[PDB]
C-alpha cells in the first residue's frame, strides 16, 4: 500500500490470521511494518482544517 | 481556547462585541497601531437592579429614538439557458 | 485563503481553507526480508508442460518475484494483465500466487 | 385503534343563558423547542484525498466542487450561530441575580441559578442537562464547537429570568424599572381581564398553586424522561447522518476496491482514472446527499428557532393576547430555561375551574333610556341583576358609573325591565 | 456599516455565480476541458463517454448551484416573511410587542426601499431619568380597600399620589381614579390614606 503522510507507533492488538487491520470505514487503520513487528499506523500530514 | 490554539492575535481582558466569530467564547476584530485583537464574549454591560417589596421606579423623562433595522427582501434573479450551456 | 476563495481580494471574517501546504520531502520503502530468488522450478523453461484438460497449478511462496530475468530469458508474445497494471507491477507485493 | 378525535362535549346554547366561572387555577405547562444543531464541518482534502499521492492533482480537478460544498456547510454552521443569537440575545443588557427575598410569597429556587454550584445552570437545567444523552476526525468530518458555550447561555437565561422577575417588561425598553412581583402579577391579571382585587384577596392560594405546579414539573421531568425526547431526536438524527455517511465510506462504489491506496498501488494512472473517478465521484455525490439532508434539517430547525425567538419576544418579554401560542389558556408569563441544543418553557397560565349558569340580558332599561355595561356582562342570580367581568364571577351593583347610556329601549332586542342604582 | 448586511447578500450571490464559471473550467476527468476539442479529435463511438462525463460534471455543478440557491432562498423567504410581518404590524398598525419593531416602546415606523432589501426607521419611546418612590398595592379608607384603576400608588413621602407606569404624572387620590373592592384586612401591604372625593 502506497501513501503520503506521517507514521505513528501504536499498541493495537490484532487477530492471529491478519496482523494487518482495517477501520470501520474500511480505511487502513494500521498496517504492520514488515521488518519491525511494532504496530505502525498512518496519520495524515494534514490535521483538522485550520 | 476550547476551539483550539489561536496564533497571530493578542487577547484582551476588555470585552468588545463580536466581529469575527472564532467560537468557544472567542471573537476577533481589527482595532488599534492597528492590529488583530482577540477577546472573550461581551455578554453585555452589567446593570444592578435592587428588588424591594415597597419600592417602585418611575421615569421622569422620555427620549424619542429613531433606529435602523435593515432587512433583505430579494436577491438577483438567476436563470440558465439550457442547450447553449450543456452543448455550446 | 486567496487560493480557496479563487480571488485576490478577501473580505473580513473567518474562512476554512483546503490544506495542501504540506509537500513530500522523502520516500521510504519497507518490504519483508526475503532475499531468495524464486524456486520457479524453471516453470517457464520446464521441458514438459501440462495438457489443457489437466492443467497444472503450482504454488509460489517465500521468494522475491523478479520478472526482469524472465524478459531477458525469453521474448513473450502475449503479456496481458487484468486488475494490476503491467508497469509498476514490480513495485507491488502479491499475497498468494498459483501459476 | 381508530384515532380518537377527542372527548365528546356538548354546549347548550340559548339566547338568555350565560356561563360565568367562579373559581380559577394557575397552571404551569412545559414546552420544548430546539434552537441549534451540532455543527458539522468537512475537511475537503481529507475526504476526497486521504493519504493519496496523486490526489493533489485530483484536488485541482474535483476539489472546487467540495469547496462549494464546504461553503454550504460553513453557511449552515454560521447560520446556527444566529439561531442562538436570535434566541438568547434579545436583550444584551445583563442583570445581576438579586439576593433571594420575598417575591409575593412565590418560590423560584428551582428556576433561578444556584450560587453554590460552580456552573451557572439552575437545578431544572441540571436535570435536563443530565437527562439528555449523546474516528470521525480520521474520516475527515469534524464537529465545530459552538460560538456560545452552555455556561454563557445559562448566564443569559439567568439574566433574562432576573429581569422578568424584578422589572416586568421594562428591562427590554432601555433602563429597567424595579417593581414588586405581586404588582406585576396583578397587572398581568388586568391584561387578561381580571380585576386587580382578585389577586390581592387570593394571593396565598395563587402562591401555593404556583409552588405546587413547580414541584409537579420538577418530579415529572425526572420521572417521565420523555419530554426531552424531541431534543434527543435532533441529536439522534445528527448521529444517524454521520454514521450513515461513514457507512457510505465502506462500500466499494462499483470499483475494484473500497480503498484508494490499493487502487493507486495495483493500477497505473492511464487505466486508473476510471476507477479513481468512479470512487471520488461517488464520494462527492454522497457528500452532496449529506448536504441536502442537512439543508432540510437546517430549514426545519430554523423554523423552530424562529418560533422560539417569537416566544422570546412575545411570551417571555410581555403578555401575549394570542391564545394557544404561549402555552394553553390565557398566558400570564413564561420562564425560559436553556437545554442541550435547545430551550424549554414553563408557561404560567390561567384556567377557569368552576362555572355557573346565570340568566343574562344584553341591556337594561330603567327610566326609558337604554343602559349598556362599560365592562362585563349582565347576570341574574334569580332575584336581583348584577354586572360582572367575563372571566370571573364578581357581582357588582348596577350603577351609573358601571354603565353608559345610549339609544332607546324599543330598538334593542332582549332588554329587560330592571332598576339602576345611582349613588 | 448598516448597509453592509445587504451588500453581503449581493456578494454572496456574486460568489456563487463566480464558482459556476470556474466550475465550467474543470475538465471533470475528460481528456480536454473544451467540448469542441473532444468532438474534433475523437470519432463518436468512444467519444460519447467523454461527452457524458463532461456534461454530467457540468450538470452536477448545476444541481449544487440549485441547492446553494435553495438555502439562500430559504434565508430570504424567512427574511421576507419577517419584513412583511413588520409592514403589517409595525408600520400600518401599532405593535404592543417589545423588541419586535425596535428597542423600547414602539411608536411607529417608516419603511424605505433599498437595493435588494428594505430598511425600517423605527420611531420609539425610551424612558429616561428614573426615580425611586415608595409604593403600596391598595389604599384603605373608611374600611374600604380602594385599588388603583389605571395607574400605580406612589408616595413622595409626604402625601400619596397616583401616576402612570411609563411617565411620572402624579395625581391626587380621588374616587374616580380608583375602584372599591373588598376589605382592608385581607390585602397585604395596605396603607392608611384618605381619599378626597370631588
Ligand atoms: C428631558 O430631557 C430633555 C433633553 O433630552 C431636556 O431638554 C433640555 O433642557 C435643558 C434645560 O432647559 C436645555 O438646556 C437643553 O438644551 C434641553 N435639551 C434639548 C435637546 O433641547 C428636558 O429639560 C428634560 N426634562 C426634564 C423634566 O428634566
Ligand atoms: C377554589 O379552588 C381552591 C382549590 O385550589 C379551593 O381551595 C381549597 O379550599 C378548601 C376549603 O377551604 C381547602 O380544604 C383546600 O385545601 C383548598 N385547596 C388548596 C389547594 O389550598 C377554594 O376554596 C375554591 N374557592 C371557592 C370559592 O370554591
Ligand atoms: C422553595 O423550595 C425549595 C425546594 O427546593 C425549598 O428548599 C427545601 O426546603 C426544605 C425545608 O422544608 C428542605 O428540607 C429541603 O432540603 C430544601 N431543598 C433545597 C433544594 O434547598 C425552600 O425552602 C422553599 N422556600 C421557601 C421560602 O419555603
Ligand atoms: C340573589 O341576591 C340577592 C341579593 O343579595 C339575595 O337577596 C338576599 O337574600 C338574603 C337571604 O334570602 C336576605 O337575607 C337578604 O336580605 C337579601 N338581600 C336583599 C337586598 O333583599 C337573593 O336571596 C339571591 N337569590 C338567590 C337565589 O341566591
Ligand atoms: C317594562 O316597563 C314598560 C313601562 O315602564 C312597559 O311598557 C308598557 O307595556 C304595557 C303593555 O304592553 C303598555 O300597555 C304600556 O303602554 C307600556 N308603557 C310604556 C310607557 O310604553 C313594558 O311592557 C315593561 N316590560 C315588561 C317585559 O314587562
Ligand atoms: C410632596 O408633594 C406635596 C404636594 O405638592 C408637597 O407639598 C407642597 O410643598 C410645597 C413646598 O413647601 C408647598 O409650597 C405646597 O403648598 C405644598 N402642597 C401641599 C398640597 O401641601 C411636598 O412638599 C412634597 N414633599 C417632598 C419631600 O417632595
Ligand atoms: C389603619 O387604621 C386602622 C383603623 O383606623 C388601624 O386598625 C386598628 O389597629 C389597632 C392597632 O393595631 C387595633 O387595635 C384596632 O383594633 C384596629 N382597628 C381596626 C378597625 O382594624 C390600622 O392599624 C391602621 N394601619 C396603619 C398601618 O396605621
Ligand atoms: C534482515 O536482514 C538483514 C541482513 O541482510 C538484517 O540486518 C536485519 O536485521 C534483518 N531484519 C529482520 C526482519 O530480521
Ligand atoms: C488579563 O487576564 C490574565 C489572566 O491570567 C491576567 O494574567 C492579566 O494580568 C490580565 N490583564 C489585566 C490588564 O488585567
Ligand atoms: C532456459 O534454457 C536455456 C537453454 O535451453 C538457457 O539458455 C536459458 O538461460 C534458460 N533460462 C532460464 C534460466 O529460465
Ligand atoms: C347549565 O344548565 C344546563 C342545562 O340545564 C346543564 O346541562 C349545565 O350543566 C348547567 N351548567 C352548570 C355549570 O351547571
Ligand atoms: C329565545 O329562543 C326561544 C326559542 O324557542 C324563543 O321562544 C324566544 O322568544 C327567544 N327569545 C329571544 C329574546 O329572542
Ligand atoms: C434608589 O435607591 C437606592 C438605594 O441605595 C439607590 O441605590 C438607587 O440608585 C436609587 N434609584 C433611583 C432611580 O434613584
Ligand atoms: C416587605 O418586607 C418587609 C421585610 O423586609 C416586611 O416587614 C413587610 O411586611 C413586607 N411587605 C409586604 C407587602 O410584603
User: For D174-197, b where at least 16 C-beta lie within 10 A, e where not — what string?
Assistant: bbbbbbbbbbbbbbbbbbbebbbb
Name subunits touching C (3+ CB pairs < 8 A): A, B, D, E
> Looking at chain C, which residue has its C-alpha nearest residue B30?
C12
Say how far apart CA D363 and CA D403 lie, in whole Å. Answer: 10
Cell numbers 473544451 label which residue? E34
Q: Count how many residues are written for chain E.
A: 198
**Residue D357 CB–ligand 11 contact under 6 Å:** yes
Helix (H) or strand (E) holding E152: strand E152-155
Say how far apart CA C33 and CA C51 lie, in whole Å. Answer: 36
Q: Can you read off the three cell numbers belonging to residue D360?
A: 343574562
Sign of CA dihedral D111, D114, D120, D126: negative
> Looking at chain C, which residue has its C-alpha nearest residue A7?
C28
| Selection from D139, D128, D110 nearest residue D42 by Cα | D139
Helix (H) or strand (E) holding B84: helix B82-86
Q: Alpha carbon of A29 to those of A9, A12, A22, C29, D116: distances in Å?
A: 12, 10, 5, 19, 46
Say how far apart CA D26 and CA D28 lie, in whole Å. Answer: 7
Q: Alpha carbon of C10 to those of D45, D343, E57: distances in Å?
A: 21, 37, 28
Cβ atoms of residues D344 and D220 within 8 Å: no
Indicate the burial class of D109 (C-beta count within 10 angstroms; 0-12, 13-18, 19 or more).
Answer: exposed
Asked if the Cβ–Cβ distance from D91 to E78 is below 8 Å, we say no
DSSP state of B27: E
Say how far apart CA A24 and CA A35 lie, in whole Å. Answer: 27
Asked if the Cβ–Cβ distance from C6 to E22 is below 8 Å, we say yes
Q: What's the D109 CA to ligand 3 centre distance in angstroms?
A: 8
Collapse the DSSP code of D308 into the 3-class scheme (helix H, G, I; strand E, B; otherwise coil) and give the result: helix
DSSP string, B51-69: --TTEEEEEEEEEEEEEEE
Say how far apart CA D88 and CA D340 lie, in whole Å. Answer: 13
Cβ atoms of residues D162 and D95 within 8 Å: yes
Say how far apart CA E151 and CA E170 lie, in whole Å. Answer: 10
Say how far apart CA E138 and CA E123 lie, in whole Å. Answer: 36
Q: Which residue puts its alpha carbon closest to atom 4 of ligand 8?
A: C33
A4 touches chain C (CB under 8 A): yes
Taking CB atoms and an 8 Å cutoff, what residues of chain C touch B21? 14
A50 touches chain C (CB under 8 A): yes
* ∠ Cα A40 A45 A49 (to 5°): 130
Cβ atoms of residues D139 and D250 within 8 Å: no
Q: Can you read off the three cell numbers belonging to residue C91?
A: 513495485
User: Which residues are CB-contacts of B15 (< 8 A; sequence separation ≥ 6)?
Assistant: B39, B40, B41, B42, B43
DSSP string, D312-375: IIIIISS----TTTSSSSEEEEEEEEEETTEEEEEEEEEEEEEEEEEE--S-EESSSEEEEESS
Q: Can you read off the three cell numbers belonging to residue B77?
A: 434573479
User: Which residues are CB-contacts of C76 (< 8 A; sequence separation ≥ 6)?
Assistant: C70
- In this structure, the dihedral spanned by the alpha carbons of residues D78, D82, D83 and D89, taken in order and rounded to 10 degrees, is 150
Q: What is the number of other CB atoms lying within 10 angstroms of the CB of residue D414?
A: 10
Taking CB atoms and an 8 Å cutoff, what residues of chain D touch E138? 197, 200
- In this structure, the dihedral spanned by the alpha carbons of residues A6, D241, D129 and D344, taken in order and rounded to 10 degrees, is 140
B75 touches chain E (CB under 8 A): yes
Cell numbers 408616595 label which residue? E155
Helices D55-87 and E4-25, packing angle to 10 deg: 160
DSSP state of D168: T
| Selection from D352, D302, D303, D312 nearest residue D335 by Cα | D312
Q: What is the number of other CB atoms lying within 10 angstroms of the CB of residue D389?
A: 17
**Residue E156 CB–ligand 6 contact under 6 Å:** yes
User: Which residues are CB-contacts of D91 (< 8 A; sequence separation ≥ 6)?
Assistant: B44, D159, D160, D163, D171, D172, E99
User: Alpha helix (H) ranges present in D8-149?
Assistant: 44-48, 55-87, 123-131, 136-139
Q: What's the D179 CA to ligand 13 centre distance in angstroms?
A: 13
A18 touches chain C (CB under 8 A): no
Per the entry, the structure determination technique was: cryo-EM
Indicate the burial class of D280 (C-beta count within 10 angstroms; 0-12, 13-18, 19 or more).
Answer: buried
DSSP state of D182: H
DSSP state of B9: S
Say how far apart CA C16 and CA B22 lie, in whole Å. Answer: 11
What is the Cα Rg of chain A in Å?
12
Say how far apart CA D155 and CA D174 lie, in whole Å. Answer: 20
Collapse the DSSP code of D32 into the 3-class scheme (helix H, G, I; strand E, B; otherwise coil) and give the result: strand
Cβ atoms of residues D327 and D31 within 8 Å: yes
Q: What is the number of other CB atoms lying within 10 angstroms of the CB of residue D400?
A: 13
Say how far apart CA C88 and CA C83 lie, in whole Å. Answer: 12
Helix (H) or strand (E) holding E10: helix E4-25
Structural gaps in chain D: residues followed by a C–N separation over 2.5 Å: 134
Bridge partners, D416 (sequence order): D364
DSSP state of D103: B
Cell numbers 520478472 label which residue? C67
DSSP state of D421: B
Q: Can you read off the three cell numbers belonging to residue E81?
A: 416573511
Q: Which residue puts its alpha carbon closest to atom 13 of ligand 13?
A: E131
Collapse the DSSP code of E153 into the 3-class scheme (helix H, G, I; strand E, B; otherwise coil) and give the result: strand
Cell numbers 384603576 label which residue? E149
Say how far apart CA E109 and CA E124 lie, in whole Å. Answer: 8
Start-to-end Cα distance in chain E: 58
Cβ atoms of residues D420 and D396 within 8 Å: no
Helices D229-248 and D269-311, packing angle to 10 deg: 170
Phi, psi (degrees; rounded to nearest 5) at C4: -65, -50
Number of H helices, E strands in chain A: 0, 3
Name the pairing type of β-strands E139-141 and E144-148: antiparallel
Indicate the burial class of B58 (C-beta count within 10 angstroms; 0-12, 13-18, 19 or more).
Answer: buried
Name the pairing type of β-strands D369-373 and D94-95: unpaired
Q: Closest approach of chain B CAs to the CA of E18, in angstroms? A: 13
Cβ atoms of residues B75 and E13 within 8 Å: yes
Of the listed ligands, the closest to the CA of B63 is: 1
DSSP string, chain C: -HHHHTSS---SS----------------------PBP---STTT-SS---SSS----EE-SSB---HHHHHH---S----SSS-STTTTTS--S-EE-
| Selection from D198, D4, D56 nearest residue E147 by Cα | D198
Q: What's the D370 CA to ligand 4 centre distance in angstroms?
A: 26
Say how far apart CA D328 and CA D323 lie, in whole Å. Answer: 7
Collapse the DSSP code of D116 into the 3-class scheme (helix H, G, I; strand E, B; otherwise coil) and give the result: coil
Residue D127: HSE in the Cβ half-sphere, 13 Å Cα cutoff? 19
Say how far apart CA D416 and CA D377 lie, in whole Å. Answer: 14
Ligand 14 is surrounded, with C-beta below 6 A, by B 53-54; D 102; E 188-189
Indicate the burial class of D64 (C-beta count within 10 angstroms; 0-12, 13-18, 19 or more).
Answer: buried
| Sheet of strand D416-417: strand arrangement | D403-408, D369-373, D364-365, D416-417
Bridge partners, E108 (sequence order): E123
Asked if the Cβ–Cβ distance from C11 to E11 is below 8 Å, we say yes
Q: Can you read off the three cell numbers belonging to residue C13?
A: 471574517
Cell numbers 450560587 label which residue? D115
| Selection from E164, E153, E151, E133 nearest residue E195 by Cα | E153
Cell numbers 508497469 label which residue? C87
Indicate the burial class of E63 (C-beta count within 10 angstroms; 0-12, 13-18, 19 or more).
Answer: exposed
Cβ atoms of residues D246 and D142 within 8 Å: no
Say how far apart CA E192 and CA E198 lie, in whole Å. Answer: 20
Name the pairing type of β-strands E139-141 and E191-192: parallel
Say how far apart CA C12 and CA E13 lie, in whole Å. Answer: 17
Cell numbers 523478479 label which residue? C66
Name the pairing type of β-strands B35-41 and B10-16: parallel
Q: What's the D26 CA to ligand 3 centre distance in angstroms?
A: 21
Helix (H) or strand (E) holding D203: helix D203-224
| Sheet of strand B35-41: strand arrangement | B10-16, B35-41, B26-31, B20-23
> Looking at chain A, which residue has its C-alpha nearest residue C26?
A4
Indicate the burial class of E117 (C-beta count within 10 angstroms; 0-12, 13-18, 19 or more).
Answer: buried
Residue D187: HSE in the Cβ half-sphere, 13 Å Cα cutoff? 18
> What is the structure's resolution, reported in angstroms to one decimal?
3.9
Residue B74: HSE in the Cβ half-sphere, 13 Å Cα cutoff? 6
**Residue C44 CB–ligand 10 contact under 6 Å:** yes
DSSP state of B11: E
Q: B-contacting residues of E 62-91, CB under 8 Å?
A: 62, 69, 72-73, 75-76, 79-80, 82-83, 86
Helix (H) or strand (E) holding D229: helix D229-248
Amino acid at each position: 500500500l502506497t501513501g503520503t503522510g506521517v507514521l505513528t507507533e501504536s499498541n493495537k492488538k490484532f487477530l492471529p490470521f491478519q496482523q494487518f487491520g482495517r477501520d470501520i470505514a474500511d480505511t487502513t487503520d494500521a498496517v504492520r511494518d514488515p521488518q519491525t513487528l511494532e504496530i505502525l499506523d498512518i496519520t495524515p500530514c494534514s490535521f483538522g482544517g485550520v | 481556547t476550547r476551539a483550539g490554539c489561536l496564533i497571530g492575535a493578542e487577547h484582551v481582558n476588555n470585552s468588545y462585541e463580536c466581529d469575527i466569530p472564532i467560537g468557544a467564547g472567542i471573537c476577533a476584530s481589527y482595532q488599534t497601531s492597528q492590529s488583530i485583537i482577540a477577546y472573550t464574549m461581551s455578554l453585555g454591560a452589567e446593570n444592578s437592579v435592587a428588588y424591594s417589596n415597597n419600592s417602585i421606579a418611575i421615569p421622569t423623562n422620555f427620549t424619542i429614538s429613531v433606529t435602523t433595522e435593515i432587512l433583505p427582501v430579494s436577491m438577483t434573479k438567476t436563470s440558465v439557458d439550457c442547450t447553449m450551456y450543456i452543448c455550446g | 485563503t486567496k487560493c480557496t476563495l479563487k480571488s485576490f481580494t478577501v473580505e473580513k471574517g473567518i474562512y476554512q481553507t483546503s490544506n495542501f501546504r504540506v509537500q513530500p520531502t522523502e520516500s521510504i520503502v519497507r518490504f519483508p526480508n526475503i532475499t531468495n530468488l524464486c524456486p520457479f522450478g524453471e516453470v517457464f523453461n520446464a521441458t514438459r508442460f501440462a495438457s489443457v484438460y489437466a492443467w497444472n497449478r503450482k504454488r509460489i511462496s517465500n521468494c522475491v518475484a523478479d520478472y526482469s530475468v524472465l524478459y531477458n530469458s525469453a521474448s513473450f508474445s502475449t503479456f496481458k494483465c487484468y486488475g494490476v497494471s503491467p508497469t509498476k507491477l514490480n513495485d507491488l507485493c502479491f499475497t498468494n500466487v498459483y501459476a | 385503534y381508530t384515532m380518537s378525535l377527542g372527548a365528546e362535549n356538548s354546549v347548550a346554547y340559548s339566547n338568555n343563558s350565560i356561563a360565568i366561572p367562579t373559581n380559577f387555577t394557575i397552571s404551569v405547562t412545559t414546552e420544548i423547542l430546539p434552537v441549534s444543531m451540532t455543527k458539522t464541518s468537512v475537511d475537503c482534502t481529507m475526504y476526497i484525498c486521504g493519504d493519496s499521492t496523486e490526489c493533489s492533482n485530483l484536488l485541482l480537478q474535483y476539489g472546487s466542487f467540495c469547496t462549494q460544498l464546504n461553503r454550504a456547510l460553513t453557511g449552515i454552521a454560521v447560520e446556527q450561530d444566529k439561531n442562538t443569537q436570535e434566541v438568547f440575545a434579545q436583550v444584551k443588557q445583563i442583570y445581576k441575580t438579586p439576593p433571594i427575598k420575598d417575591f409575593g410569597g412565590f418560590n423560584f429556587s428551582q428556576i433561578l441559578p444556584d450560587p453554590s454550584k460552580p456552573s451557572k445552570r439552575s437545578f431544572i437545567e441540571d436535570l435536563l442537562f443530565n437527562k439528555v444523552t449523546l474516528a470521525q476526525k480520521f474520516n475527515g468530518l469534524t464537529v465545530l464547537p459552538p460560538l456560545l458555550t452552555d455556561e454563557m447561555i445559562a448566564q443569559y437565561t439567568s439574566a433574562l429570568l432576573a429581569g422578568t422577575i424584578t422589572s416586568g417588561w421594562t428591562f427590554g425598553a432601555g433602563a429597567a424599572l424595579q417593581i414588586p412581583f405581586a404588582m406585576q402579577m396583578a397587572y398581568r391579571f388586568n391584561g387578561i381581564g381580571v380585576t386587580q382585587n382578585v389577586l390581592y384577596e387570593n394571593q396565598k392560594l395563587i402562591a401555593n398553586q404556583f409552588n405546587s405546579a413547580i414541584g409537579k414539573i420538577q418530579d415529572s421531568l425526572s420521572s417521565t424522561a420523555s419530554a426531552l425526547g424531541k431534543l434527543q431526536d435532533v441529536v439522534n438524527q445528527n448521529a444517524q447522518a454521520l454514521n450513515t455517511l461513514v457507512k457510505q465510506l465502506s462500500s466499494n462504489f462499483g470499483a475494484i476496491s473500497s480503498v484508494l491506496n490499493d487502487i493507486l498501488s495495483r493500477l497505473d494512472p492511464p487505466e486508473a482514472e476510471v476507477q479513481i473517478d468512479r470512487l471520488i465521484t461517488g464520494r462527492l455525490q454522497s457528500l452532496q446527499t449529506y448536504v441536502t439532508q442537512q439543508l432540510i434539517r437546517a430549514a426545519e430547525i430554523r423554523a423552530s428557532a424562529n418560533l422560539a425567538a417569537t416566544k422570546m419576544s412575545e411570551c417571555v418579554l410581555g403578555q401575549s393576547k394570542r391564545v394557544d401560542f404561549c402555552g394553553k389558556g390565557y398566558h400570564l408569563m413564561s420562564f425560559p430555561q436553556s437545554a442541550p441544543h435547545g430551550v424549554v418553557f414553563l408557561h404560567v397560565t390561567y384556567v377557569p375551574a368552576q362555572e355557573k349558569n346565570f340568566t343574562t340580558a344584553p341591556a337594561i332599561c330603567h327610566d326609558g333610556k337604554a343602559h349598556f355595561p362599560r365592562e362585563g356582562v349582565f347576570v341574574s342570580n334569580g332575584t336581583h341583576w348584577f354586572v360582572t367581568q367575563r372571566n370571573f364571577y364578581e357581582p357588582q351593583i348596577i350603577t351609573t358609573d358601571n354603565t353608559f347610556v345610549s339609544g332607546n329601549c324599543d330598538v334593542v332586542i332582549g332588554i329587560v325591565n330592571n332598576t339602576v342604582y345611582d349613588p
